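Progress note, project year one: complex with magnesium ion.
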Amino acid sequence: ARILGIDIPNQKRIEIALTYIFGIGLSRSQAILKQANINPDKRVKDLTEEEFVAIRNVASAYKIEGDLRREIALNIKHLSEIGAWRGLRHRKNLPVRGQRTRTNARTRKGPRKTVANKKIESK
Amino acid sequence: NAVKYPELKIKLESYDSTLLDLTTKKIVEVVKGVDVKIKGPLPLPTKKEVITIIRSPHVDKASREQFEKNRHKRLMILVDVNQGAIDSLKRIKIPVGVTLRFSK
Amino acid sequence: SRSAKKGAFVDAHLLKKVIDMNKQEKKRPIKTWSRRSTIFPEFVGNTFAVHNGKTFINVYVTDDMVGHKLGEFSPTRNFKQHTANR
Amino acid sequence: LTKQTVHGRAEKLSGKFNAGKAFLENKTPKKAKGKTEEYTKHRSLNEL
Amino acid sequence: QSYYGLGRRKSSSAKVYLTPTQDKGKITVNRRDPSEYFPNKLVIQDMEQPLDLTDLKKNFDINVVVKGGGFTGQAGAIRLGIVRALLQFNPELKKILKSKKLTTRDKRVKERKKFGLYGARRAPQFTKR
Amino acid sequence: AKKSLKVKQTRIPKFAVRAYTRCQRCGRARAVLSHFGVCRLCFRELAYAGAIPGVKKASW
Amino acid sequence: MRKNRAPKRTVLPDPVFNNTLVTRIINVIMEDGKKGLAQRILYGAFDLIEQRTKEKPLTVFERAVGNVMPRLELRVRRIAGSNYQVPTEVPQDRKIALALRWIAMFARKRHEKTMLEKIANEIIDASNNTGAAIKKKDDTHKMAEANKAFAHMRW
RNA sequence: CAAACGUGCUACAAUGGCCAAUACAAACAGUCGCCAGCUUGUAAAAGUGAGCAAAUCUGUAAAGUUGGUCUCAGUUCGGAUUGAGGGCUGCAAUUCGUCCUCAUGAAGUCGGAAUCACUAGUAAUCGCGAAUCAGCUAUGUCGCGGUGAAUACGUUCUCG
RNA sequence: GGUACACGAAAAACCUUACCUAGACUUGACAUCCUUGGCAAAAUUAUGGAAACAUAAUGGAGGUUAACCGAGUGACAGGU
Ligand SMILES: [Mg+2]
Ligand SMILES: [Mg+2]
Ligand SMILES: [Mg+2]
Ligand SMILES: [Mg+2]
Ligand SMILES: [Mg+2]
Ligand SMILES: [Mg+2]
Ligand SMILES: [Mg+2]
Ligand SMILES: [Mg+2]
Ligand SMILES: [Mg+2]
Ligand SMILES: [Mg+2]
Ligand SMILES: [Mg+2]
Ligand SMILES: [Mg+2]
Ligand SMILES: [Mg+2]
Ligand SMILES: [Mg+2]
Ligand SMILES: [Mg+2]
Ligand SMILES: [Mg+2]
Ligand SMILES: [Mg+2]
Ligand SMILES: [Zn+2]
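Model obtained:
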């Protein structure tokens, strides 16, 4: 569309259109929606320039969606440049919190690389 | 003549049932041998506790027996008592198991 | 996570040694067993020997490490390579 | 062109450490174990 | 001359008051419109099942009090309650009502969960290995 | 190492969170019934002798 | 090995069109133990049938379901390799049951929109002998006609 | 933690997602507790504070009904993972507590060979309570109720 | 194997805990029997302390030693 480098779907309501932007989710979109007084349920294609200026200003007041990516990148670099045990644990692509790593937590380990289980000839 | 106690609300509860019935018959007989109008021996819901215990010592959680402990409960409200009843109330001797909840 | 009213936490044994050790110029690595103590701003510039479980690993605090817990910058267990089972 | 800096942490968290040091130096040994008290009996026949 | 019936189903009592009238039955449940007490998922007919096939023109005004259960269970209680009130007005009605088995307690209640089992009759998944 | 834990349990600790409940007959720590202060396998032996008034087997 | 014949629960006459069969198919489309939901879906399809076919909904439903209803059933009987089948005449109660079970299974797989319209199209599509249920009935029938020879030996 | 298996939870959706209003339980538990109402807070919760030693007071029933919207998309599905800010318990939450808010949005569109449970309030499903417990991704366990099916022709095969 | 694998464990942050690294103890943290006295153990505040533990403090319910607080003392206690 026209809001920064994001191209929000044209046949979709505005409160979901803001969610499609990277730095704006759903709850904050309603906050932008309510604060700007713009009524929901108005398809973005059927909107005028008067609303398009108020939303850009408030979006600019919040954290830029493009800057959050650099915000996440520095935090990992900030945690890794500290030498934290959580940082080392974040370093080797493993759960950073307390999740178990015995039989689960594959969403951070990608696909399974099947090895060869021990040979049991009986004892 | 006097009263000294309006609305004496005696409450009974015990783990056993038959002794509790026996206590209600003995209490009523003495208080009607004196001049008091009993409202009535009403039954209250019995609070039942259940504990689940595994039978086996080490393994096999599946085999678990059960136990129960019933708190049978009764209510008794006295309208007018007077000395004639209180002094006779001293010689009642309630079997240990039954527990009294006198509320004055 | 940790509440506001409570604030931070040090065992206050670490606090007494650090104030004495900061005043003294010839500072040497401080031997602390308290992995529970949060790194306080005044701690900056000192070095500590946290008990990893076996030995005392030396940590040099900076103006950046302020805020986390003193045991978070040291390990407790070690794993570096498996072995083919079959 | 640079707007100085708007980061640096410290300041905000610094108040949190100040709160913690005040609590630790405040610490009063108010050790206790309980709450409500009294009303603990099983009644009798008011004299047996 | 009113008549009283007490039905039950799934631990749900019922107090149905049958009053003779000649100005339309005016179905009523717990001082509220039937259309408001039930999801109106067509459940209203069931209770009238023994009051339909015989007759409803006698326009008996019903004063129902049900306390407990969900909504079909409460409905089950009042159907039995209407029939039990019905056994005081023309004991002949009983015969035909008995036929369809509309004068018997359903005797169907939820069983107790058993230890080692995932429910009343469920059981954990067995493994050959 | 049973007696010392039993003895330590009687002794008051230095922290409130340091207090746990142990069986009073044996020294078993886990599966202790706070309603009776007796573990599950002493409660079975004791229940099968009639020491606790009212604990009957349940049929529901 | 049982020697006992199971009892049968009542089928109940339908509460609207007074056509028992509606209650059975309601229970068939039942999912999640929702009596209400299933009724709503099904009854809603009749309103669409009125709007579309301009005819009585009960008449269309009987013409579709009775027509989809099969005649022969092939029972598997293995001896040594694969299975030689055996065509048998199904009882009337089971006869109706396969049609309703089949009507729902092909209704929950169509490329259409909300299953309300989905099931409505399936019932209207089976009144003209051109649908998904027809092909299934045709297929089992052709296998039975092909397997007419082994009908004498059953077990 | 390179991996493999078992038991469960959550899903891959319009019999649904979200929002608003709203009807109907049983059982159980409670004075270091249950906590009503009120005030503050986007919320977890905090403060005030009655009532209840209990058929009295407290522990919001949810599915369900109606209305609005989505219109079949890896999406208003799905919630993982990850970052930050908060709340509670506790000396103490990094190793290794959970809850809330915000941010991101993995896989997954019905699952191969082969397998499991169940004969009515049963299978399936929706909530509620208790035990151990200061607190606990117990989705476990033990209980209670709400809605509520389909099928059994027969012993030829299969296991015991 | 069926009859193990949401099993013992109806609650592993510390405690639990039985494991490892360390800092400390030896008729012992707990018990009896014996010669012998009781004019305490606690808890808490100080200093050193990772805390065990030490050195100083209010010297403590009570009942004259009942229970325990001890000394001496070898049989022994103790082992998840
Ligand atoms: Mg964990
Ligand atoms: Mg032992
Ligand atoms: Mg389960
Ligand atoms: Mg909807
Ligand atoms: Mg009242
Ligand atoms: Mg995909
Ligand atoms: Mg989702
Ligand atoms: Mg944490
Ligand atoms: Mg699809
Ligand atoms: Mg059976
Ligand atoms: Mg399910
Ligand atoms: Mg075995
Ligand atoms: Mg430890
Ligand atoms: Mg430990
Ligand atoms: Mg003295
Ligand atoms: Mg003496
Ligand atoms: Mg031994
Ligand atoms: Zn024991």
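DSSP finds four helices and three strands in chain E.
Chains E and A do not touch (no CB pair under 8 Å).
No further modelling is planned for this target in the current period.
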